[PDB]
Ligand binder design. Structure first.
Ligand SMILES: Nc1ncnc2c1c(-c1ccc(C(=O)Nc3cc(OC(F)(F)F)ccn3)cc1)nn2[C@@H]1CCCN(C(=O)C2CC2)C1
Length: 258
């Protein structure tokens, strides 16, 4: 299956503390560079996650952080993935790399590709945000932590700033809720890691979201690009474009800038 022998891993350095515990860098079998996530005890519904990991393991796409396996025959649980040299996208954006507007749209395309794949498989992310994206040594952005919020053990919140009205009111997660979050993700990229609704608390942001207050147009984003992210914020979920339409629109803008 997808079980990796924990005795075939080696911890060289600790990259930091992500969601669910610490992340290590090391070698798999003494042959492959990999990152190792140590699921902190008591931070996740492990039984449900272990059984669901089989489905998430089979998801294959270049813009999805490639998963190599897990170590569930022990504790803490291990998750072996590829090593993204540049780490989290949020910290990567807040470090100005002298980002060119063409590069910003490039990052949106990377995420939109992975989301279009998850959409084709009817797999919801539920927590799409710059903090959950990773960048490799070549500057490619890949989506991660997809479908994990459903197993988080809680021991308004912050993710409200990325949620649509139907999620804040009825927790009605769907493909259109990922569309809304992706629109906010585009806002973070063109905002260079700026926090959405930084002036309001979590509860205040939810109130303004329920009232219709959309995120403003970032400075580095043209009206052409802002129209794409703005389309993700239709009040009616059924009126929001799919990731196929979003990816198609992003491709049209990139082709014109060529
Ligand atoms: N791969 C990396 N490479 C370089 N750095 C990496 C990382 C990671 C990472 C490692 C594994 C997963 C992970 O398991 N995703 C998953 C599991 C799933 O479950 C299953 F697998 F399907 F079962 C299902 C879906 N996605 C996520 C992320 N985190 N980090 C850094 C950790 C510390 C903070 N940080 C930063 O950037 C700040 C600036 C210092 C990021």
């Amino acid at each position: 299956s997808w079980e990796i022998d924990p005795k075939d891993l080696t911890f060289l350095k600790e990259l930091g503390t992500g969601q669910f515990g610490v992340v290590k860098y090391g070698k798999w079998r003494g042959q492959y560079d990999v990152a190792i996530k140590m699921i902190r005890e008591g931070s996740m519904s492990e039984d449900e996650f272990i059984e669901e990991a089989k489905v998430m393991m089979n998801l294959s796409h270049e813009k999805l952080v490639q998963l190599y396996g897990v170590c569930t025959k022990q504790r803490p649980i291990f998750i072996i993935t590829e090593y993204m040299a540049n780490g989290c996208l949020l910290n990567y954006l807040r470090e100005m790399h002298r980002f060119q507007t063409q590069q910003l749209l490039e990052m949106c395309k990377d995420v939109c590709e992975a989301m279009e794949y998850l959409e084709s498989k009817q797999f919801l992310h539920r927590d799409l945000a710059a903090r959950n994206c990773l960048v490799n040594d070549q500057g490619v952005v890949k989506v991660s932590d997809f479908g994990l919020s459903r197993y988080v053990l809680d021991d308004s919140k912050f993710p409200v700033r990325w949620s649509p009205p139907e999620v804040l009111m009825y927790s009605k997660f769907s493909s259109k809720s990922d569309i809304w979050a992706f629109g906010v993700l585009m806002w973070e990229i063109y905002s260079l890691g700026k926090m959405p609704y930084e002036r309001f608390t979590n509860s205040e942001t939810a109130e303004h979201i329920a009232q219709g207050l959309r995120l403003p147009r970032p400075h580095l984003a043209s009206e052409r690009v802002y129209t794409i992210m703005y389309s993700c914020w239709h009040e009616k979920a059924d009126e929001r474009p799919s990731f196929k339409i979003l990816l198609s629109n992003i491709l049209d803008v990139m082709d014109e800038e060529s």
